[PDB]
Coordinates of C-alpha atoms and ligand atoms in Angstrom, one line a residue:
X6 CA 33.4 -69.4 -48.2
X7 CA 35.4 -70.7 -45.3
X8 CA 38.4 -68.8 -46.1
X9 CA 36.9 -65.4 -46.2
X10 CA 34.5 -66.3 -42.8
X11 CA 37.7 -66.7 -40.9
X12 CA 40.1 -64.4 -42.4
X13 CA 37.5 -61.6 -42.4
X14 CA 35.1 -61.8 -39.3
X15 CA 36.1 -64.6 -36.4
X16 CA 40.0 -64.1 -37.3
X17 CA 39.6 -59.9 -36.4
X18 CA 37.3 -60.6 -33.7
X19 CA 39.6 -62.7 -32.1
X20 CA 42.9 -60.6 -32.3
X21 CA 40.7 -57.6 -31.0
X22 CA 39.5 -59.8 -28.1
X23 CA 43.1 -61.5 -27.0
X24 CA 46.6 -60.5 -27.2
X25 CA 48.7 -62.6 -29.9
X26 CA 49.8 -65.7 -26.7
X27 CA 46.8 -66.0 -25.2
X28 CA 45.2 -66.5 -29.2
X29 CA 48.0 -69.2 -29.4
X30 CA 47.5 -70.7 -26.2
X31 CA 43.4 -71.1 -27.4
X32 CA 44.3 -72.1 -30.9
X33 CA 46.8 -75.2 -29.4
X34 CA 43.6 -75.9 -26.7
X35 CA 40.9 -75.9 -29.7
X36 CA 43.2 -77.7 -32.2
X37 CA 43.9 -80.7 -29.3
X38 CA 40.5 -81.4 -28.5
X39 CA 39.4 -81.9 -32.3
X40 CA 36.3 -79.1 -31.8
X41 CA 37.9 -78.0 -35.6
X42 CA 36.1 -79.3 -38.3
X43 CA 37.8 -82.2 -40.4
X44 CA 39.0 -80.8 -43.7
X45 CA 37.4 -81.5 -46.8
X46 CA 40.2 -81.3 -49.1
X47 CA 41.2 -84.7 -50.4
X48 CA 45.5 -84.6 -51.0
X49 CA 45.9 -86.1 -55.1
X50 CA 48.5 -88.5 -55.7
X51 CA 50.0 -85.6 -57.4
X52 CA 50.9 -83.5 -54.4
X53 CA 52.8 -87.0 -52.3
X54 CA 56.3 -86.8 -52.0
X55 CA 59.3 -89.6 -50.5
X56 CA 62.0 -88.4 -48.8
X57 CA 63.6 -88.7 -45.6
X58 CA 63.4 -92.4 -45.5
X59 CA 59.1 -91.5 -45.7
X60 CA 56.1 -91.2 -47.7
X61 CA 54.2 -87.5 -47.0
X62 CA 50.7 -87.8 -48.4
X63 CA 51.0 -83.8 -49.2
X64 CA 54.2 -81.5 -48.8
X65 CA 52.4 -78.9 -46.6
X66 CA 53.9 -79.0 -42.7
X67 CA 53.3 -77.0 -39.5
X68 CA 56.4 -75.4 -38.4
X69 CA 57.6 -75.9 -35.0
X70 CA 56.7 -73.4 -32.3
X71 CA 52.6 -73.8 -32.8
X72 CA 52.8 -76.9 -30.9
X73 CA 56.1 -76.8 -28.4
X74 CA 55.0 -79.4 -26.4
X75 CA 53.1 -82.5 -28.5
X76 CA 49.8 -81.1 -27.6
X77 CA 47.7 -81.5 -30.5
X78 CA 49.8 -83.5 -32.8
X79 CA 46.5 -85.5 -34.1
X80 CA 44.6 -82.1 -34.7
X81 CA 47.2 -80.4 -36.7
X82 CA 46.8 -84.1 -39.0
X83 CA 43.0 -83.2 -39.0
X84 CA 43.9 -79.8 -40.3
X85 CA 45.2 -81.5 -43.8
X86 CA 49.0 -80.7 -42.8
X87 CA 51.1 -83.3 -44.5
X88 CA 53.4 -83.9 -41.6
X89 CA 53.6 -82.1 -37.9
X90 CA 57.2 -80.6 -36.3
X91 CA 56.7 -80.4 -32.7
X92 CA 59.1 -78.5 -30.9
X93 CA 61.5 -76.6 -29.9
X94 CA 61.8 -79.1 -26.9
X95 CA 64.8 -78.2 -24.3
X96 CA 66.2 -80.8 -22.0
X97 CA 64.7 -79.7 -18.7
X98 CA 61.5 -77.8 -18.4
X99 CA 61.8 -73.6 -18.3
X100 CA 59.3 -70.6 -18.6
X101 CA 60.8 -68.6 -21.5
X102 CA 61.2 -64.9 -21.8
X103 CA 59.6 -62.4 -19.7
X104 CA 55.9 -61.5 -21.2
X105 CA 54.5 -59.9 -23.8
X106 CA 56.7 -61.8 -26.0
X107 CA 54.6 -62.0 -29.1
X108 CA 53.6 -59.2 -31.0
X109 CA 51.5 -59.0 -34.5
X110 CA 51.9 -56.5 -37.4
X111 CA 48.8 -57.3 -39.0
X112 CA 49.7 -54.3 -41.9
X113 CA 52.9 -56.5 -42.7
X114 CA 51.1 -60.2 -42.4
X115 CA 54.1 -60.8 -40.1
X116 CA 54.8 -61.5 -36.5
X117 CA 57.7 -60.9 -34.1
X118 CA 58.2 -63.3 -31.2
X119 CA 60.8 -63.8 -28.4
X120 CA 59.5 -66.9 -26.5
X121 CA 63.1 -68.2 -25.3
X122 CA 62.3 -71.8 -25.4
X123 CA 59.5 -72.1 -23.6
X124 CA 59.2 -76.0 -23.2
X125 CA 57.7 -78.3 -21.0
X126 CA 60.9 -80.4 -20.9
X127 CA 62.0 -83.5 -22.6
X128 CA 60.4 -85.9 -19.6
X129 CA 56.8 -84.3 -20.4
X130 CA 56.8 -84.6 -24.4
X131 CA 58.5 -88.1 -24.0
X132 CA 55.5 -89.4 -22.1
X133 CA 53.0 -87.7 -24.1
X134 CA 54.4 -89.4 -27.7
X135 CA 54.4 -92.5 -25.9
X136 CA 50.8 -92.3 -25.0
X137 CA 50.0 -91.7 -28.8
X138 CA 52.6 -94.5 -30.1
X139 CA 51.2 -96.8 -32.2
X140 CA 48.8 -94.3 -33.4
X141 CA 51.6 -92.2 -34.9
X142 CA 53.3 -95.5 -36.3
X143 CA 50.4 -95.7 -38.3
X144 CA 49.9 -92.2 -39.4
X145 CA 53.1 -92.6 -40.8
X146 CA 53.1 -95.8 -42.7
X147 CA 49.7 -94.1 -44.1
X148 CA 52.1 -90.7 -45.1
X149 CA 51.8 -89.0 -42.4
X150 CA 55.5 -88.3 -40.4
X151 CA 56.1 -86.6 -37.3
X152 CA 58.9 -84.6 -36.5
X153 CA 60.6 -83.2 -33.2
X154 CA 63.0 -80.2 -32.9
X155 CA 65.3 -80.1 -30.0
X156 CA 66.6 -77.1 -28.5
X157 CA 68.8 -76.2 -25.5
X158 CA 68.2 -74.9 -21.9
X159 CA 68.8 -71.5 -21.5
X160 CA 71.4 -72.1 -18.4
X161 CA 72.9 -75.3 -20.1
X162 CA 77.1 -75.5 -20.1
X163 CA 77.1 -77.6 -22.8
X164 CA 75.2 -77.4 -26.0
X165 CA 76.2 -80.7 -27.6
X166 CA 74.5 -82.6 -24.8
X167 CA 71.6 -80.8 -24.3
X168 CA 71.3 -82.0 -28.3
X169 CA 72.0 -85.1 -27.4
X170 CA 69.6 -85.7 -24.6
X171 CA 67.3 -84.9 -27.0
X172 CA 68.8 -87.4 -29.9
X173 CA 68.6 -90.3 -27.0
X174 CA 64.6 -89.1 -25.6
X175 CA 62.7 -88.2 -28.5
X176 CA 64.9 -89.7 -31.5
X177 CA 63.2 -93.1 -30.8
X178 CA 59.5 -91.2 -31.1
X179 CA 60.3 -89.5 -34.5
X180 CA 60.5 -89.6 -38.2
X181 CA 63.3 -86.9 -38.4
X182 CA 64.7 -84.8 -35.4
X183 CA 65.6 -80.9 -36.4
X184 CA 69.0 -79.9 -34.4
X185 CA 67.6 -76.0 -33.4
X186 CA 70.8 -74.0 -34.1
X187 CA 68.9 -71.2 -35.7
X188 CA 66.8 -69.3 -33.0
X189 CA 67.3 -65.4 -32.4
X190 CA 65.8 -65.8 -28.8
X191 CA 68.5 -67.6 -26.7
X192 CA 71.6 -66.2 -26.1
X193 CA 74.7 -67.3 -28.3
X194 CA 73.1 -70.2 -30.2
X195 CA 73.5 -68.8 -33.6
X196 CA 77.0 -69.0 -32.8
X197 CA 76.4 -73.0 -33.1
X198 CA 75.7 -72.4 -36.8
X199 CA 79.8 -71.3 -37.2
X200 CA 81.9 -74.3 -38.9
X201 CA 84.0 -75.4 -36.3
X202 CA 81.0 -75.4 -33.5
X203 CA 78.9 -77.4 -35.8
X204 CA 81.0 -79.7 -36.9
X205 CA 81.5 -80.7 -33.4
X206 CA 77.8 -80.3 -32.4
X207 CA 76.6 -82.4 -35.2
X208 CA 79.3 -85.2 -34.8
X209 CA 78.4 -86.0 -31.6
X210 CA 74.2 -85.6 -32.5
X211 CA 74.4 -88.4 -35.5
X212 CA 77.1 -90.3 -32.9
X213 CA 73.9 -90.4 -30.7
X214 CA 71.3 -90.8 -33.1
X215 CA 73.5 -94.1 -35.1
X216 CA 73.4 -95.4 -31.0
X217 CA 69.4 -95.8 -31.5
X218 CA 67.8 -99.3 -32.8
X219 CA 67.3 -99.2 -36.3
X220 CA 63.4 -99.2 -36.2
X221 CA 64.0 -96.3 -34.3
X222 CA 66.5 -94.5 -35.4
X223 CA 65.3 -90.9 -37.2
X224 CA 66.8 -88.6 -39.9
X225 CA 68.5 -85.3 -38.7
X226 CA 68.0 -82.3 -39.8
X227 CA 69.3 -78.5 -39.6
X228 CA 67.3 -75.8 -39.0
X229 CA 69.3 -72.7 -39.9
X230 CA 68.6 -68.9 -39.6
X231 CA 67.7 -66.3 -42.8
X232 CA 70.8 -63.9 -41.7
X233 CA 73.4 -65.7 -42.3
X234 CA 76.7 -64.7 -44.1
X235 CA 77.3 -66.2 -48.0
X236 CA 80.8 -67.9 -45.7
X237 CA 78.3 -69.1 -42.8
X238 CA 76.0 -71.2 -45.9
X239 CA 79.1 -72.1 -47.4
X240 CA 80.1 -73.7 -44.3
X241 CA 77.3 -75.1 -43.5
X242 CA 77.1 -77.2 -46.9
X243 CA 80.5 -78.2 -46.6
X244 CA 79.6 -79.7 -42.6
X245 CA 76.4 -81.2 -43.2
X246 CA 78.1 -83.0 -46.7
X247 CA 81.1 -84.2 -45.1
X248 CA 79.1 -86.0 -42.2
X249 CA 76.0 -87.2 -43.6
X250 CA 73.4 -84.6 -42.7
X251 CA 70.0 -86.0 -43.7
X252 CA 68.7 -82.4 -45.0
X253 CA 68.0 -78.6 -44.1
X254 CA 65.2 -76.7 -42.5
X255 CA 65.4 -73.4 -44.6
X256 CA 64.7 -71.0 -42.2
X257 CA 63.8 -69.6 -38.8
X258 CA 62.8 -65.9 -38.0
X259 CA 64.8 -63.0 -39.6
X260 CA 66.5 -60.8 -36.7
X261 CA 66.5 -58.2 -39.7
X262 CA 63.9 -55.6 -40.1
X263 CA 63.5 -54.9 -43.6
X264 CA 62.5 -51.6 -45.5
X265 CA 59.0 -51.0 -45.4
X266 CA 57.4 -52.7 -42.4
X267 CA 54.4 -51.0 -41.2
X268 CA 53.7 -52.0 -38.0
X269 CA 53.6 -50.6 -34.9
X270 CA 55.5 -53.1 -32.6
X271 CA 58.0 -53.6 -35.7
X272 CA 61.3 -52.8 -33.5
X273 CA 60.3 -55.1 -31.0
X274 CA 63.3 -57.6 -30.5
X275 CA 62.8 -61.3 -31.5
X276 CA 62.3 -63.0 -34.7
X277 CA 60.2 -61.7 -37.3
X278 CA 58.3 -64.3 -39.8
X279 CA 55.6 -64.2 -42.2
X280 CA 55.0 -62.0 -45.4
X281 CA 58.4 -59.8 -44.7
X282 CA 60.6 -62.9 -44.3
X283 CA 59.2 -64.8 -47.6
X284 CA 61.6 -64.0 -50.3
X285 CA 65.1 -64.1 -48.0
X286 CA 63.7 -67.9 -47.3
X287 CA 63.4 -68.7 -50.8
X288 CA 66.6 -67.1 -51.6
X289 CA 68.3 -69.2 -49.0
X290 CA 66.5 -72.4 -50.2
X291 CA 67.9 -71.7 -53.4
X292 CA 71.8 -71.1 -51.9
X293 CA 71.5 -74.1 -49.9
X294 CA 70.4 -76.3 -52.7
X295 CA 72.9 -75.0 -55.0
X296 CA 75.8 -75.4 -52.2
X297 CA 74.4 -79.0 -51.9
X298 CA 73.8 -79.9 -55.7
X299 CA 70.7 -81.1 -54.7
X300 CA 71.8 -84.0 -52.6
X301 CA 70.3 -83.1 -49.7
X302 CA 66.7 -82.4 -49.0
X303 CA 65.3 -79.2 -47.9
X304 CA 62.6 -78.6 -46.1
X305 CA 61.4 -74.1 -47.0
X306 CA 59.7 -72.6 -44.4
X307 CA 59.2 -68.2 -44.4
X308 CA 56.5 -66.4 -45.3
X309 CA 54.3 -69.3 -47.2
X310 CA 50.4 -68.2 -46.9
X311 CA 49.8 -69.6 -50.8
X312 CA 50.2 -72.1 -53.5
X313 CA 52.2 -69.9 -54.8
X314 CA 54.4 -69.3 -52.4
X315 CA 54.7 -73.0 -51.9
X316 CA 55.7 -74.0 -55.5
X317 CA 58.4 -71.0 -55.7
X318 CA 60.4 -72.6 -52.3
X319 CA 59.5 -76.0 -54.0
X320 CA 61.1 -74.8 -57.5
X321 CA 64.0 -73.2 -55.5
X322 CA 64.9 -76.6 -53.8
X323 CA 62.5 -77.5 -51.0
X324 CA 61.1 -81.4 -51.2
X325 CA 58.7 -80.6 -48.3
X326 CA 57.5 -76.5 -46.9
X327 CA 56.1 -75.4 -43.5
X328 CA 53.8 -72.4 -42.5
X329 CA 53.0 -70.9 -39.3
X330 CA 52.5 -67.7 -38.9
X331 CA 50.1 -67.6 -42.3
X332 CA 47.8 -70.0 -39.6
X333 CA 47.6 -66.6 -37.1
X334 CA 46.1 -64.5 -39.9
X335 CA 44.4 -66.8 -42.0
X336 CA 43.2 -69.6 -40.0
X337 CA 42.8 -73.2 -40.3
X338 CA 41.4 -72.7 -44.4
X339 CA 44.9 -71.7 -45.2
X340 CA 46.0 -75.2 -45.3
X341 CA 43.6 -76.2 -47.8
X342 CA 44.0 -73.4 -50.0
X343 CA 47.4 -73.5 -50.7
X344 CA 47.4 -77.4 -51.0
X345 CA 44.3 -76.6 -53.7
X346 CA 46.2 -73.3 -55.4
X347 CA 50.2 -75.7 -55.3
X348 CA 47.8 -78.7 -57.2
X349 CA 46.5 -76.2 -59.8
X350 CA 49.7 -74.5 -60.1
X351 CA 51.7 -77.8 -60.7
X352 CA 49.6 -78.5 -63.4
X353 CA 49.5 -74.7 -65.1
X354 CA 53.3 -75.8 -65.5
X355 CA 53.3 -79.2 -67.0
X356 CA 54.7 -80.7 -63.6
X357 CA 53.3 -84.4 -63.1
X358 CA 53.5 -84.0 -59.3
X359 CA 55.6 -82.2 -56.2
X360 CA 58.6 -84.3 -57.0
X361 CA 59.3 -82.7 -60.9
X362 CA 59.3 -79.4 -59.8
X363 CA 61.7 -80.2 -56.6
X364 CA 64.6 -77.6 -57.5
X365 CA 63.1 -76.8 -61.2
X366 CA 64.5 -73.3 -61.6
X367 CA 67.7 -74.8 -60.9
X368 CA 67.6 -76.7 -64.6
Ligands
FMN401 C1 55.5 -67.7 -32.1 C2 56.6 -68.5 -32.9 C3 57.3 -69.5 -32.3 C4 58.3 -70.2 -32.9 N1 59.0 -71.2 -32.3 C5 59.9 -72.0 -32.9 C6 60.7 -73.0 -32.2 O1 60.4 -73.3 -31.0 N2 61.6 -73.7 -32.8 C7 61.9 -73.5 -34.1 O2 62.8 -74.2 -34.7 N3 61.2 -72.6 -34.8 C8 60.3 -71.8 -34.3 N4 59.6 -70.7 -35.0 C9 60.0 -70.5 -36.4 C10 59.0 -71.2 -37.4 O3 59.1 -72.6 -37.2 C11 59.4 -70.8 -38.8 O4 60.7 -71.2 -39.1 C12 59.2 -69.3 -39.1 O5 58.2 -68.6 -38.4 C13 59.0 -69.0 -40.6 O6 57.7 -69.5 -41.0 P1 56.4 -68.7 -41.1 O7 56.7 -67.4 -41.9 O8 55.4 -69.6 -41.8 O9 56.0 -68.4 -39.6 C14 58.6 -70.0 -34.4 C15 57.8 -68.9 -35.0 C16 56.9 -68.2 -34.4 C17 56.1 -67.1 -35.2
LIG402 C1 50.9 -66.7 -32.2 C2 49.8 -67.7 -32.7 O1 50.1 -68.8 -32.6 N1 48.6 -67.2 -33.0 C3 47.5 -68.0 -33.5 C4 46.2 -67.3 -33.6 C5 45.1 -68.0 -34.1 C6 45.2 -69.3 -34.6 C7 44.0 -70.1 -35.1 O2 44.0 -69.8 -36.5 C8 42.6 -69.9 -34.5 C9 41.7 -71.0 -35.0 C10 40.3 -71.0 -34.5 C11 40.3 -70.9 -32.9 C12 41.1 -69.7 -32.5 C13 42.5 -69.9 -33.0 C14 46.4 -69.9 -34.5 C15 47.5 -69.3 -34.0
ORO403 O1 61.1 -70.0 -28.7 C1 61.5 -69.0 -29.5 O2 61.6 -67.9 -29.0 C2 61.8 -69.2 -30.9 C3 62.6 -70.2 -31.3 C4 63.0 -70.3 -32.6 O3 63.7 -71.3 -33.0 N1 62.5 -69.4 -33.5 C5 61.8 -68.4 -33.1 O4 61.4 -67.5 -33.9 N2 61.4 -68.3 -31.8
CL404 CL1 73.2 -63.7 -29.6
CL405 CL1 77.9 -61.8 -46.9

């Protein structure tokens, strides 16, 4: 009913009225205000998961880069989203790439982007959290966390303490804080993702993050690309073991093209996500989680648009998923369906809840 209203009339009419930015730049403006209507779906007991030090009424996030700036935090809540990423936040303010910079390949259900880090600064989101406090203090006690993903200014000398700026701002306004290591749009910061670099990186982010009061003090999280070498995850496991890495974002955009991608703009640079990226996430969820031994949680995000989709990330070691780009074809209904479809599916398979199937294939 809903679903197929947005996904086959207002959804079209809308991506042949505005380009793919200025549809996001709506979508964030509509979302903030609440004009979206409240969703109906009920979350079951069945679906809650703990982890992180946190109660999440459903496993079903938005992925950061929908709302960079904590705009409509209490919106995306309204939405039926389990828990809200915010982010990526840099330091300092900064426009981001040249436009366009966003580009859809509606034949692939995918989209490419090269935003850059376009962020209204760490000053900006700081104050707008604090307006919205106590509120989010109780969302979360009710299972409803908030995260905040931290990136790095484009001109920055050091990487490390634009990371830690962000560990001493925003760590006191989160649940978990996502170290950004993983984005194909700013130059050299993949790079942070190598042993050596992260090991150092990381040290002094959980140095910071220890430094907060206790009441306030967040996990940390890694947020790691889909291209990475079988070394690079290797690596990685060994460095987030070693010094007490909270869990795993699992992934960002693919800088890959793969074979059969239909769309026009589909060798624009950037990251691609959706449909195309889906399988290499869960593939990496399933590496990570196996490098790991299941001893730290991750959180699968690539290509989820279905229940589905969800359960096989869940299966292959994710505690928690995100969406985003399923949101830009879809619409709003998308949440609810695959929260519905992961419910149905979790019973189909004898699974009591979320938490029994966490890492399932691996047994
Ligand atoms: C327009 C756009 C902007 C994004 N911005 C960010 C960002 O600022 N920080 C970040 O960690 N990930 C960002 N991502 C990556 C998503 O959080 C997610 O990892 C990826 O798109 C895969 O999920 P999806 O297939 O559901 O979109 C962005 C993705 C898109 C499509
Ligand atoms: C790149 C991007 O973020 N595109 C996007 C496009 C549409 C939507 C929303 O589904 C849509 C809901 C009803 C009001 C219009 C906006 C979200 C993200
Ligand atoms: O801002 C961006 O360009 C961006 C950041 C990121 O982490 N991932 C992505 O796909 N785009
Ligand atoms: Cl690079
Ligand atoms: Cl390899």
């Amino acid at each position: 009913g809903d679903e197929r209203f947005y996904a086959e009339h207002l959804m079209p009419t809308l991506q042949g009225l505005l380009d793919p930015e200025s549809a996001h730049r709506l979508a964030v403006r509509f979302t903030s205000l609440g004009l979206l209507p409240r969703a109906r779906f009920q979350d079951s007991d069945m679906l809650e998961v703990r982890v992180l030090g946190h109660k999440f009424r459903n496993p079903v996030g938005i992925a950061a880069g929908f709302d960079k700036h904590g705009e409509a935090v209490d919106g995306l809540y309204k939405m039926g989203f389990g828990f809200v990423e915010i982010g990526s936040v840099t330091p300092k303010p900064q426009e981001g790439n040249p436009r366009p910079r966003v580009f859809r390949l509606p034949e692939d259900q995918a989209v490419i982007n090269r935003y850059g880090f376009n962020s209204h600064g760490l000053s900006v989101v700081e104050h707008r959290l604090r307006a919205r406090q106590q509120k989010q203090a109780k969302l979360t006690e009710d299972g409803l966390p908030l995260g905040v993903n931290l990136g790095k200014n484009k001109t920055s000398v050091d990487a490390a303490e634009d990371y830690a700026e962000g560990v001493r701002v925003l760590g006191p306004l989160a649940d978990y804080l996502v170290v950004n290591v993983s984005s194909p749009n700013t130059a050299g910061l993949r790079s942070l993702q190598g042993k050596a670099e992260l090991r150092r990186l990381l040290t002094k982010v959980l140095q910071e993050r220890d430094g907060l009061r206790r009441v306030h003090r967040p996990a940390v999280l890694v947020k790691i690309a889909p291209d990475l070498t079988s070394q690079d995850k290797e690596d990685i496991a060994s460095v987030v073991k070693e010094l007490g890495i909270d869990g795993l974002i699992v992934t960002n955009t693919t800088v890959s093209r793969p074979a059969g991608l239909q769309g026009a703009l589909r060798s624009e640079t950037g990251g691609l996500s959706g449909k195309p990226l889906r399988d290499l996430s869960t593939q990496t969820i399933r590496e990570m989680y196996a490098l790991t031994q299941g001893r730290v949680p991750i959180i699968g995000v690539g290509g989820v648009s279905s229940g589905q989709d969800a359960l096989e990330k869940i299966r292959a070691g994710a505690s928690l998923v995100q969406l985003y780009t399923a949101l830009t074809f879809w619409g709003p209904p998308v949440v609810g369906k695959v929260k519905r479809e992961l419910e149905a599916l979790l019973k189909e398979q004898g699974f009591g809840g979320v938490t029994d199937a966490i890492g399932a294939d691996h047994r």
